[PDB]
Design a protein around this ligand. Structure first.
Ligand SMILES: Nc1ncnc2c1ncn2[C@@H]1O[C@H](COP(=O)(O)OP(=O)(O)OP(=O)(O)O)[C@@H](O)[C@H]1O
Ligand SMILES: Nc1ncnc2c1ncn2[C@@H]1O[C@H](COP(=O)(O)OP(=O)(O)O)[C@@H](O)[C@H]1O
Lengths: 511, 79, 79
């Protein structure tokens, strides 16, 4: 048995490699004298899927190193497509034909010619047969499988499939014998990451550049979700500070410093700022009780085995910063995975491009254990307008099934809408699908207003005395983003005229 | 085009509802009995998949306020 | 554009019904005496392609509740 992971190359996924070893590759490592009776033909092909950056391509070559081929030829799918019809399929034919010579020449004792596809998922779209929608590339796959399971079948081969979209592949491409067996890779647990860190450090520890104040046990777990690929870049970044340390003139952690730089596959901390200008200004009880409620039912999820999915939307009148509150609710529990979906970046897209950004985000999210995702300004991406009813049916349809779509077993998430008007939604039947709602009343009163202004501190006691004298009495109904807007508009004034400008403008709010 | 149809009734009855709690065991005898005093001679029309979210959302709470918000959020739906 | 039409009628009479059942032979005369006394004087609008579902869907029950369900189902459509 040659399958031990004390060999350094990869780690953390030990069970999955064990499995392929268990049922996939046992035939090829066993004394053949027995099986030569049984005539058991080997797996010709295998599939493994998972997130992109989790070190799958070093598995394949490692089994090639483990059980020696001449060498791998690795290819990328898009590296072969041609406008000219003949060329693309022919390339594949060359790849296979390299082996057939040895197989027929040297019979059935030949060594493996191994193949790897970096991503199939474009080429292996599931063709379907009818007069229309035959397909664009539906004829390359025929040549492929005809090589795999075809006439003059060969036992001289091994082929590795790779994808991040396992469901689009045709079911016959992967029927048993052509590729029988599938494995899932999922983003590694902290144990796998401490192994990986042991790996990439193993030279540094030996060369003793980094001798001190370095613990992988904490430094692994402080990140709950990363890809093993980024960590090597991280280690390279960790290597960069010692070289950026000698710009001034034997190694230090800069990891705690640099982790803020890195966009993860998972959570990001640097996207708040555009959404959070000012932080969370608590003007009164409703604000704090709301985000307290957020902190309340988040625990529901994290402590629930029977409700993986939960959902709310923060409704309220406009310009109350519901977006910001949702962002804070995300930021409050230090989740593994948080992400924004917003029209800001999906701008100027068709009804089926933004959908494919959205399915991308959630199926990206499904495979994390615990997550919080947020969608802002539902009305906008739904492309709602009152004059005419107009919207894209596609979007809400594909959205609400996701609100009713449970992720795979053992993974849980909550989802957050910021919709500012729900009458449409009640009419449009998204509101029965959401579990529950939050009214976010905008500030209704001056006694709360001046309090907030004291928290900001723009205005003096006299400037504030002005307000306190004139109106205690009105109930002003105002969204706060507008408040900030016009104080900044009055903050520029002749000081004597500063305040009553604010007041006069403020009395134009309506209702 | 469809041959026949079958109406799944939603759960009208408090007793029937109470039996499910009795079945699931999310709630203890003391509170369930408190509900029995509270809700009987009563018709309640709420969804099952709604119920799950209710009992759990309350089941994460401190016990004193737990049931109180439960039936409050339940009575949020009259019919 | 159509040169002519044909109205196809739908089964109007327990008479046509029960003789159709004489034809199929699924139900024998004894139970049909009951169904006779049930249909006479009343009108029926149902087409047979739906009937031929009702026949077997009732058939799969035990014989005693057989015909009572059959007609009791047909109450819905006949009304
Ligand atoms: N606790 C708070 N109360 C009120 N406003 C806050 C609070 N915390 C932050 N904000 C402010 O909310 C503003 C965000 O704007 P806002 O999200 O209200 O526009 P919007 O509501 O998305 O627009 P629309 O009303 O069309 O949805 C920021 O300036 C932010 O500082
Ligand atoms: N144990 C491991 N787990 C995850 N990733 C690893 C591990 N060991 C190495 N890696 C990194 O995983 C990366 C995989 O990159 P590659 O396979 O080229 O892109 P993709 O993973 O998207 O196909 C490699 O660059 C490698 O540095």
């Amino acid at each position: 048995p040659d399958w031990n992971f004390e060999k350094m190359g990869i780690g953390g996924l030990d069970k999955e490699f064990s499995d392929i070893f268990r049922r996939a590759f046992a035939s090829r490592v066993f004394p053949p004298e027995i099986v030569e009776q049984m005539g058991c033909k080997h797996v010709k092909g295998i599939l493994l899927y998972g997130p992109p950056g989790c070190g799958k391509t070093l598995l394949a070559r490692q089994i090639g190193k483990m059980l020696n081929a001449r060498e791998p030829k690795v290819v990328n799918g898009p590296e072969i497509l041609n406008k000219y019809v003949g060329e693309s399929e022919a390339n594949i034919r060359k790849l296979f034909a390299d082996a057939e010579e040895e197989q027929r020449r040297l019979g059935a004792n030949s060594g493996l010619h191994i193949i790897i596809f970096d991503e199939i998922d474009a080429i292996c779209k599931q063709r379907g047969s009818m007069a229309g929608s035959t397909g664009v590339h539906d004829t390359v796959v025929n040549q492929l499988l005809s090589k795999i399971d075809g006439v003059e079948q060969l036992n001289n081969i091994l082929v590795i499939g790779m994808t991040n979209r396992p469901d689009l592949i045709d079911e016959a491409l992967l029927r048993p014998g052509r590729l029988e067996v599938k494995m899932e890779i999922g983003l590694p647990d902290e144990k796998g990451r401490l192994q990986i860190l042991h790996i990439h450090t193993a030279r540094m520890r030996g060369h003793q550049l980094l001798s001190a104040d370095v613990d992988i046990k904490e430094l692994a777990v402080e990140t709950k979700n990363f890809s093993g690929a980024e960590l090597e870049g991280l280690v390279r970044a960790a290597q960069s500070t010692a070289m950026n340390r000698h710009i001034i003139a034997r190694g230090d952690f800069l990891a705690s410093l640099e982790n803020d730089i890195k966009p993860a596959f998972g959570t990001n901390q640097e996207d708040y700022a555009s959404y959070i200008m000012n932080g969370i200004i608590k003007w009164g009880d409703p604000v704090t009780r709301v985000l307290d409620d957020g902190e309340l039912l988040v625990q529901q999820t994290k402590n629930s085995d029977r409700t993986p999915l939960v959902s709310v939307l923060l409704e309220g009148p406009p310009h109350s910063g519901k977006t910001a509150l949702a962002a804070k609710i995300a930021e409050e529990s230090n989740f593994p995975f948080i992400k924004i979906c917003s029209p800001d970046k999906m701008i100027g897209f068709s009804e089926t491009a933004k959908c494919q950004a959205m399915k991308k985000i959630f199926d990206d999210a499904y495979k994390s254990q615990l997550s919080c995702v947020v969608v802002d300004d539902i009305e906008r991406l739904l492309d709602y307008v009152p004059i005419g009813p107009r919207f894209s049916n596609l979007v809400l349809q594909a959205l609400l099934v996701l609100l009713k779509k449970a992720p795979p077993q053992g993974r849980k998430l909550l989802i957050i809408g910021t919709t500012s008007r729900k009458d449409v939604l009640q009419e449009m039947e998204m509101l029965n699908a959401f579990s529950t709602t939050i009214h976010v009343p905008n500030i209704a009163t001056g006694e709360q207003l001046l309090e907030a202004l004291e928290l900001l501190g723009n205005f003096k006691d006299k400037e504030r005395t002005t307000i306190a004298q004139q109106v205690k009495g009105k109930k002003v109904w105002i969204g706060i983003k507008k408040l900030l807007m016009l104080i900044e508009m009055s903050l520029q004034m002749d000081p004597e005229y500063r305040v009553r400008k604010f007041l006069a403008l403020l009395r134009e709010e309506g209702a």
